[PDB]
Every structure is written in C-alpha cells, then in structure tokens.
Design a protein around this ligand. Structure first.
Ligand SMILES: [Zn+2]
Ligand SMILES: [Zn+2]
Lengths: 142, 186, 241, 113, 269, 119
RNA sequence: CGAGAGGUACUUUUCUUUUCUUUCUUCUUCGG
RNA sequence: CCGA
C-alpha cells in the first residue's frame, strides 16, 4: 500500500518549535536510492523518475554494463546543469519518458525560432504561446 | 475547600509560572539577531540556546525593548493563570462576588491575595536587577544581577523584572518584599 | 474644558514602560502641541498602495523592500578590522585597509562593488571633511590582499583606500589620516540616506488618514535638518520607490 | 596605534618613512636611533562602535531591532492571525525567502513563503 | 462491549488523577482500574472537564455504568455521567487468557519438502496480545534493553496450524503462523494526571529490522511456541484460515542464511 | 471573477545538483503530500455548508489545491491545516468506516437515484 | 505682618467571556 | 502505465 506520512519523518516538538524526526525508514530509503540494490551479478543505479512516477512513489533504475553506464544514459538525454532548482531538475529528467511512438529524425539545421507574443495587463504577466507551434500540411502526413 | 485542593492549586500555579517563563523566553527570540535560528533550517545551537535560563533574564533587564516585548508576553500568558480563581473558588466567595458585581476590586487583586503576586516591574532604569529566584541562595550569589555588574563587559543600568511565586497570604520573603517595595515605590 | 480637565486629574501619572509614556503626559503632549520647536524628531508615517495586494504576501515584501531601501546603514557596521599598511608611481605611502567578511555583505544584501560605489558617492558629494590637499581618492576592491599582518580570514574581502597627493609629502602624515580620513568614510552610509534614524513596520487597526473603502504601515524617524529644508521635502527625495 | 620601545633610550618610537630608501623606519625622538620596522603595520583596530561607555543600557540604543508582525495570515496548527515575518536565507538556496513565525504561545509552528 | 475505556462526562477541574482513582476504587473493587487519563489544554497545569478511564474487565464496566445511570457516583458534589469513548487508552485485549506472557517466539521457513522448520533466530520471554476488536496480533520482543513491537494483522495470516515441539501429539506446545505479507515493526523511544498502572509512558515509531542477522525480513513463516496449549485452542480458533488438525514438525538448524545487506531475501550468487 | 495564476517563488541554489538533492526531493515527496485530501475536503465543505463554492473555507481549499498541484514543479508543500477537515462524510462516498451523515445536497439525490434504479 | 518646618489631602480608577486547538495513521480528480 |  501507499507509504503514509507517519511511517517516516515523525514530528516531535523539541526545544521551542516542532521538528520532524527522520526514523530508520528514512535512512533506509535514502541508502537504497544512494547505493542501490544488488541482485545477481549486477547493481541497479538511480537513473531518473517520470512525472507520474513521483506521485506513485516509483523510480527507474539501470545497471552499469560494459557498453553503457547509469551516467551515460542520463547525459544522453541532455545537460541539466543550467537548472538551479531541485524539483525542476528532477522534473525535466522525466519529461523524456512518455509512452510514445517514434518517427523520423529532424536534423539540427531545420530550426526556425519565431519571436513569441505576450500581454501584461494590470501588472499580471500573461502569455499566449505556452507550448504551441507550427507544422506544415505534408509534415502531418509524414 | 480543603488542604488537597490548596496543594493542587499551588502545584498548578508553580507550573503556570514556569510555562509563562518559557513563553517569555520563546517571545524574546523575535529579534533581528536570531533570524538564522527562527528560519526553518539546520541549527547547531538549537539545544544550547534553550537551556540559557539566566542569560535570557540578564539580557531581558539590560535592554529596554526586550523587557517591553516580555512584559506583554507575560501579561497575556498570565490571563490563564488568573483564570484559576473561578475553578477553585466557590460561588459564596466575597471577593468573587465583589469582583463580578464591579463594586470594588477585580480578579487581579484576588490572584495576588490568594495564589501569587505575579509580574513585578518598574518603568525606571535602576542600577540593579533581579536574580530570577528570590530565595536565600539568590541573594548571596556574587555573579547575580542584584549586586551590580555581573561581568557578561560591565553593566551600567538595569530594567527590573521579577516574578514572585509567593502571595500575600502565605507570606513574602525579605528579598521578595524588597522587590515589591522597589516596584511599588513609584 | 471641564470635561477634559476631569479626565486630566483622573489619569495615571506613572509611565507604563521606558519606550512609552504616561497617559497624562500623552494628553499633555497632544494638548500642548503648538510649541513649533523641540527635539528635532519629526516622526512620519508612510502607508502602502492598493496594487501591492495583487501578489502572494505582497504587502510584507513591499514593506521589507521599503525598509531595506530607506534605512541608514553605516560603513562601520559592515567592516570588522581596519588597518593602515605601508605599501611601498605609488604616490602614497599610507593605504587604509578595510577587511569585510563575506557573511555580513550577504546578510545585509550588499556586494563588494556597491560599497565602493556608495563610498565614492559620499566622497564626491560631501565636502565636510577638512582639506588635506586631496585631488582624488580611488578605492580598489580586492578579494585577497597581500598584507602579511594576520591571516585569520580566508573567506573575506578587502577594501584599499588610497589618497592622491599633489606631487608632494604634505598629505603623508599619519595622524591626520588616522584622525580625519578614517572616521569620515566610516560614518558614511552604504545603504539608505544620511538623515533617517530608524524605520520600523507596524500593524494597526484604527489608523490616521483612513482609506476610501487592519493594514501594515511604516513609521519613519528622520534626523533634524539643520538647514532650511523640511524633513518631508527630504523624505520625498523615495524617488526610486 | 601599535607602539614599540627604544633599544637604549627605552622610550616611545615614531614611524618615519625614508623617502630616499622607500622603506619604513622607527626613529626615537629623544635619542638618535633609527630602528628597522617589521611587516609595515602602523595601525590596527577592531572596529567597535561602543563610543557611549556606561550609558548605552540606560536609554534604548536599539542595537538589536524587533521583527515586524502581521495579522493578514493564518497559521496551520492554530487558527491565529498574528504572526512574525522576517527575511533570511535557506541552507543551500541563493537569494532571500520570506519566513513566518506564529505568535500564539501554544502553537510553535513556523513555515516559509 | 468491544472496548472497556469509559469517558466520564463531568469531572471537577480542581482534582488530580489519584483522587478520582481512589474514588473509583472505593466505589468499585480494589485495583480494578487499569488506565486513567485526564486531557490537558496546557502542558501540566490545566485539566479539562472530562476524563477517560479504562477498566480491567467488562463486568466492572457494566457495574460502573449501572451505578452512573442510577445516579450513585457523587464525587465532590458532582454526579459522574459515563458514556462511550472513541478508542482504548492502551491497545490491550480485555481477556486474562489472551495475554500470553513469557513465551518462546521463533522465526523461519519450511526448509525441505516435508513440514519442517529451520530457525534463524530465537526470542525468549516475549509477549503476545491477540486484539480481536482491532483485528491484529502484536508481540513484544525485548533485545538489548529496548523492546520492538511487531504488529501482525489478520489479513496477512493465511494458514494457522497447531504444532508440537516435544513430539507427543497431546503436548501441543507450538502454533505455526504463515504470513503472506510482512509485519509492521515498531520501536520504543524515550506525569501527574496519568496513573496507567504500568510502564506505558513512551511512543511507537516505525523503524527497520532490529536484528543484527536480519532474520525478520526473510521470516514469512512464524512458530509461536507456547508453554502449555490445552484450552488455548478455543482462542486460536478465532484466527482466520485455521486448519483444525494437529501436525508435527522438525526443528532444523538454520543459522546459515545470515546476510548484512539492506536487501535481505536474496540467494547467495 | 477568476482567481490568481502566479504560483510560489522558485527556489534557486547557489551550486549544482550533487545527485543527492534529487533523492531528498523524492523521499520528502511522500511526506507533506496532502493532495489526496484537498479535493475531498472541498467536496464535503460544499455539501455541508450553504452558499457552496463561495465561502472562505472553499477559497482557502481552492488556493491550496493550486499550490499542491505545483508541488511536482516547485518545492513548495501544501500544508493542509487543522480545523478544516470535515470529520463527517456525505452519502455519496465509499467510506463505510467514518461516522457518515445523510447528504441533503444534489449529490445525495444523484446517489439515491441509482439505488432507485438498481432495486 | 513676612519666612523655615512638619501634617490632612489622587482610593483599584480599567483585567477581560472564566467555555479558544490534539478522537489520532489515512482514498487527488480526469482520458487512453 | 502514461499526459494536465
Ligand atoms: Zn587588506
Ligand atoms: Zn499558529
């Protein structure tokens, strides 16, 4: 079943204000995420987790073989050093994990950046081009 | 009504004053020097800053704003200590009748008559403080704020702040009577 | 007048604390308020705008950004160790070294270049310092000075103050630099203006000058202007905000 | 501020920079002696603004201001409106985030912005 | 009739728990009150207008309810009114036979193709509380001073047996439990209005396995060795999926599977 | 009129991620996750209270829902307060353990209309 | 007739419900 | 299982 908020990080008022106390389940799940599991002649390392894996308390794991490793598959997706957040750097590593069907590869020369449009009414920032884009008639057929 | 009710009343007063002292010690941390401690982070001195029971009383009397934010922090926590005269007192009590009728007196006079005097402070800057115990051992302490400069660098002026655990019925200590005389001379 | 005097006799003639006053003195200061001089206090009370409530906790952030902008913060409260180091064209034998830790600059929301810019902004606008035949005063910020005196802070910055001499040694005396040049820039603010004593944020329930249709407000205490300018006309120049 | 003593005169010394040698020397005013200086340090002072000695504790000098209080919020544990707000930093963040501290004496709760 | 914890409606606010305890033990029998708790708004100096009392049996609870309904409980000019509480003050089964004291608990799994049992570790002098109303069973395993509560639900048990260690079929001294899921492990960590009659002033937090050899994580089968199981068969018949049959077993030596990793139920590759 | 759209302030660190803060964010996502109770408490506080979806206890829950759905985006928890849980469930729920109560809203009528059909 | 002394003479003159929170560990909602 |  789902792990509750009382099986780990139990609250305990110590001193002036209350403070959450991390029990042995906290240090167990942290040790499993850090070191990994070791079944067979293999060892599974933390790759990433998707957006719905975070709500369902699941995670993806990979074993470092002779060909690739757990770091190479992570840097093959992209470079996450330009994100100074803790939640967004984890959320952008689960963006490329959707249940999809692959199509042909578009080269790096076929990029065209249109300047966006936005409105600012009464001090509140708004935008119309959140994630939209343009595509041709024949590209939908291909 | 009997001796056990008076013993339970004194045991409740002795814990209510100890809780009000902790309320004032909590409220004394609301300054611009403990902003790294009041924030939700990992502090190393979180167990060493709470045990300073005499340093907080020394810092409350040396400055004028920390005593002003602690008098108001004692006076609202004492509203639950003053609410014990209606539980233990009977409906045929003459002081409760004269206080609920509004003819003469209030509950603040009955608390000092029966349970405890409470907060004793003066609005004038003097050259001595109160040793937070008002006992015989507190008067003979050489590193006490009652004598003068405690050496924490010397001290020049104090704002007197003292709580009397006794009342006007059980009798006051000579140090507690001196504290009451200083706070009532004005 | 009888209804006011009857409230004047039956009032508490004892002060509550050292910060406040008696209810009798508070009535006396209100009734005898036309003295047109005294103590140079001139306390003001600024309010907040209506459009600041469009953000999450916008009033608290606005009051904190105001109190961070128009409060005086001297240069002496930022430095930790001042020294004079014989550095040796050099053109100056004495260089004032001001070492500042990197924690108080992040705590007061300052930087190593902003304090040099605000020191130059007070040097180029205040001629109250006595004349030592000074033509220029350059300030060189350095995060690691080579002054081999006491290597006790490896995570602090240094500020070197150098006086420009007019091809002579009439400025090179130590006593004048120690007594005039050092307290001039140490009593100069790096944040806010010079004529504001203290700013505190207060919460009120029945405020003066009510709105059209409980709120947070600030209480600015300004220094007494010795010139002909008013304290309100100096508070208005609140030009960035 | 750093004072030294003469070798034979046993008097005070004064710093005297030699313009023809571009060095620092300490010359005795009474006896004709010019000693070699060391480390070029002629002044050192831990900057303490306590210029009002034995008078700062009588009147409120306000060397430690109070934190402001607001009543336009509500705590999570208790349903109290009064709360202490201030600005600080986190353990590893970069910037300044708003914190809150409840004013209720029995709540003991604190939360971020 | 499920719980014995009774909530008194109007207690005086000028009393202590000892004055109510002596009053209840004067009106009812001697030391018939197990737990007593007066909730406080403050820490230790402001009791509330009600209190919770837990008795030792149901007969004294019904007698106290009959005395309260007839208005025969006058404590300092206050008529006590009894009602029903929400839960027990201490999760303890109200049965003198269900609280098995000083028994032998051993863990393991069937090793061979027969109905044998290999023991990894052995726990001596443990408690056993069969909570029928809460539908769970709990054990108190003391190890290196501190104790660890091991909660086992009724839905996790899929096969209840009746074994015999001493060989004789009439000497039923073991009860084999088969757990589908795993048990919840707890830990004990470390004053005026609470009497409580025993040592229960602590708290339970969910921790990991306490054994140094980590035997509990690979302990899907249990074996409750009792002192003398003769009339306990009527109590153990209330366990779900209880096979009504006596069957022997063999205590195999099983200290070989001793790993030190966090992931316990793995074969040595 | 509509509600606000800007969420909480983002939290930027002064260094790079050392692959342990992601572990801490994944483990601390289990605790302080009150996303499962906001939509329940809003649905009960709209059934038990008249002038539904316009009272203050509905506006605080609507703000807490918009703050809780951004917990996967930014690291700001929801912090569901006390004195806002209903402690009583309506008729159109499957919670047969809580001390429920007969719902007088349109949801109780729609729940009884299917019992009138499966009879 | 003016000066110096001691004495009567402001007494509580504004604290607010005395009923304010610990019965806790509990389903996110939609479409493939 | 996946996408707001
Ligand atoms: Zn330097
Ligand atoms: Zn609160």
């Amino acid at each position: 079943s789902k792990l509750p908020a009382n099986a780990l990080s139990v609250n305990s008022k110590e001193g002036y204000f209350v403070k959450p106390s991390r029990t042995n389940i906290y240090n167990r799940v942290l040790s499993i995420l850090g070191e990994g599991i070791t079944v067979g002649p293999k060892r599974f390392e933390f790759l990433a987790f998707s957006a719905s894996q975070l709500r369902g308390n699941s995670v993806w794991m990979f074993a470092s073989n002779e060909k690739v490793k757990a770091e190479d598959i992570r840097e093959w997706m992209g470079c996450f050093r330009k994100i100074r957040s803790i939640s967004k750097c984890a959320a952008r590593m689960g963006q490329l994990f959707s249940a999809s069907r692959q199509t042909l590869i578009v080269r790096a020369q076929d990029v065209e950046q249109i300047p966006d449009i936005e409105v600012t009414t009464d001090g509140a920032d708004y935008c119309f081009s959140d994630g939209i884009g343009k595509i041709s008639l024949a590209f939908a057929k291909q | 009504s009997d001796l056990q009710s008076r013993k339970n009343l004194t045991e409740e007063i002795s814990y209510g004053l100890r809780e009000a002292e902790q309320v004032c010690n909590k409220q004394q941390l609301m300054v611009e020097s403990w902003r790294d401690f009041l924030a939700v982070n990992g502090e190393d001195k979180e167990e060493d800053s709470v045990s300073d029971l005499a340093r907080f009383c020394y810092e409350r009397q040396k400055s004028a704003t920390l005593s002003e934010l602690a008098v108001s922090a004692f006076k609202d926590a004492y509203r639950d200590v003053q609410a014990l005269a209606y539980r233990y007192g009977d409906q045929s009590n003459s002081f409760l009748i004269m206080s609920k009728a509004g003819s003469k007196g209030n509950i603040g006079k009955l608390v000092q008559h029966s349970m405890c005097i409470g907060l004793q402070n003066s609005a004038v800057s003097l050259s001595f403080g109160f040793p937070r115990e008002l006992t015989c051992a507190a008067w003979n302490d050489p590193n006490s704020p009652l004598r003068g400069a405690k050496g924490k660098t010397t001290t020049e002026s104090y704002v007197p702040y003292g709580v009397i655990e006794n009342s006007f019925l059980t009798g006051l200590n000579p140090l507690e009577s001196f504290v009451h005389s200083v706070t009532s001379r004005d | 007048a009888c209804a006011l005097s009857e409230a004047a006799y039956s009032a508490l003639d004892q002060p509550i604390s050292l910060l406040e006053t008696s209810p009798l003195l508070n009535l006396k200061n209100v009734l005898e308020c036309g003295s047109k001089k005294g103590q140079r206090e001139q306390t003001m009370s600024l309010y907040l705008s209506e459009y600041l409530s469009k953000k999450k906790h916008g009033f608290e952030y606005g009051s904190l950004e105001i109190k961070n902008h128009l409060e005086k913060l001297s240069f002496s409260e930022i430095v930790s160790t001042s020294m004079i180091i014989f550095s040796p064209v050099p053109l100056s034998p004495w260089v004032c070294h001001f070492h500042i830790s990197e924690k108080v600059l992040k705590r007061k929301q300052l930087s190593a270049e902003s304090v040099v810019s605000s020191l130059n902004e007070q040097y180029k606008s205040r001629n109250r310092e006595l004349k030592l035949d000074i033509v220029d005063l350059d300030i060189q910020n350095t995060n690691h000075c080579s002054s081999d005196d006491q290597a006790m802070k490896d995570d602090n910055v240094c500020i070197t103050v150098t006086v420009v001499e007019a091809s002579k040694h009439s400025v090179l005396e130590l006593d004048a630099i120690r007594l005039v040049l050092i307290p001039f820039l140490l009593d100069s603010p790096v944040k806010g203006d010079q004529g504001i004593k203290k700013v505190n944020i207060l919460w009120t329930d029945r405020p003066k000058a009510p709105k059209r249709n409980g709120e947070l407000y600030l209480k600015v205490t300004m220094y007494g202007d010795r010139g002909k300018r008013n304290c309100w006309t100096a508070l208005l120049e609140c030009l960035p905000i | 501020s750093t004072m030294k003593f003469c070798r034979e005169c046993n008097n005070i010394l004064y710093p005297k920079e030699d313009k023809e040698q571009k060095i620092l020397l300490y010359a005795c005013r009474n006896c004709d002696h010019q000693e070699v200086a060391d480390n070029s340090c002629v002044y050192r002072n831990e900057v303490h603004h306590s210029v009002s000695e034995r008078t700062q504790i009588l009147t409120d000098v306000a060397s430690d201001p109070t934190l402001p209080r607001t009543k336009a919020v509500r705590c999570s544990k208790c349903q109290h409106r009064e709360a202490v707000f201030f600005q600080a930093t986190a353990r590893g963040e970069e910037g300044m985030t708003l914190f809150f501290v409840c004013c209720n004496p029995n709540c003991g709760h604190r939360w971020r912005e | 009739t499920n719980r014995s914890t009774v909530k008194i409606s109007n207690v005086p606010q000028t009393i202590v728990a000892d004055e109510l305890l002596r009053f209840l033990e004067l009106h009812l029998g001697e030391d018939t009150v197990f737990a007593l708790e007066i909730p406080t708004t403050r820490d230790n100096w402001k009791p509330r207008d009600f209190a919770r009392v837990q008795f030792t049996t149901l007969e004294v609870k019904s007698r106290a309810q009959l005395l309260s309904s007839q208005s025969k409980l006058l404590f300092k000019t206050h008529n006590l009114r009894l009602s029903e509480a929400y839960d027990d003050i201490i999760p303890r089964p109200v049965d003198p036979r269900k609280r098995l004291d000083d028994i032998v608990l051993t863990v393991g799994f069937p090793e061979s193709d027969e109905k044998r049992f290999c023991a990894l570790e052995k726990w001596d002098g443990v408690r056993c509380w069969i909570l029928t109303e809460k539908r769970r069973v709990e054990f108190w395993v003391w190890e290196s001073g501190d104790c660890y509560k091991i909660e086992v639900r009724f839905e996790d048990i899929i096969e209840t047996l009746s074994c015999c260690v001493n060989g004789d079929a009439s000497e039923i001294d073991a009860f084999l439990l088969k757990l589908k899921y795993g048990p919840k492990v707890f830990k004990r960590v470390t004053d005026r209005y609470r009497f409580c009659k025993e040592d229960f002033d602590f708290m339970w937090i969910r921790t990991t396995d306490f054994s140094g050899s980590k035997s509990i994580g690979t302990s899907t089968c249990f074996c409750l060795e009792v002192h003398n199981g003769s009339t306990m068969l009527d109590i153990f018949s209330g366990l779900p999926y209880y096979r009504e049959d006596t069957l022997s077993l063999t205590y195999v030596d099983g200290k070989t599977f001793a790993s030190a990793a966090q992931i316990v139920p793995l074969l040595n590759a | 009129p509509p509600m606000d759209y800007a969420g909480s302030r983002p939290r930027l660190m002064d260094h790079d991620v050392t692959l342990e803060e992601i572990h801490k964010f994944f483990v601390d996502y289990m605790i302080s996750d009150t996303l499962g109770v906001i939509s329940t408490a809003h649905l009960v506080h709209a059934d038990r209270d008249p002038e539904k979806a316009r009272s203050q206890k509905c506006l605080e829950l609507a703000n807490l829902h918009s703050r809780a759905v951004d917990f996967a985006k930014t690291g700001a928890p929801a912090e569901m307060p006390y004195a806002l849980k209903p402690r009583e469930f309506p008729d159109f729920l499957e919670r047969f353990e809580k001390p429920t109560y007969i719902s007088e809203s349109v949801f109780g009528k729609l729940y009884r209309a299917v019992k009138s059909s499966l009879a």
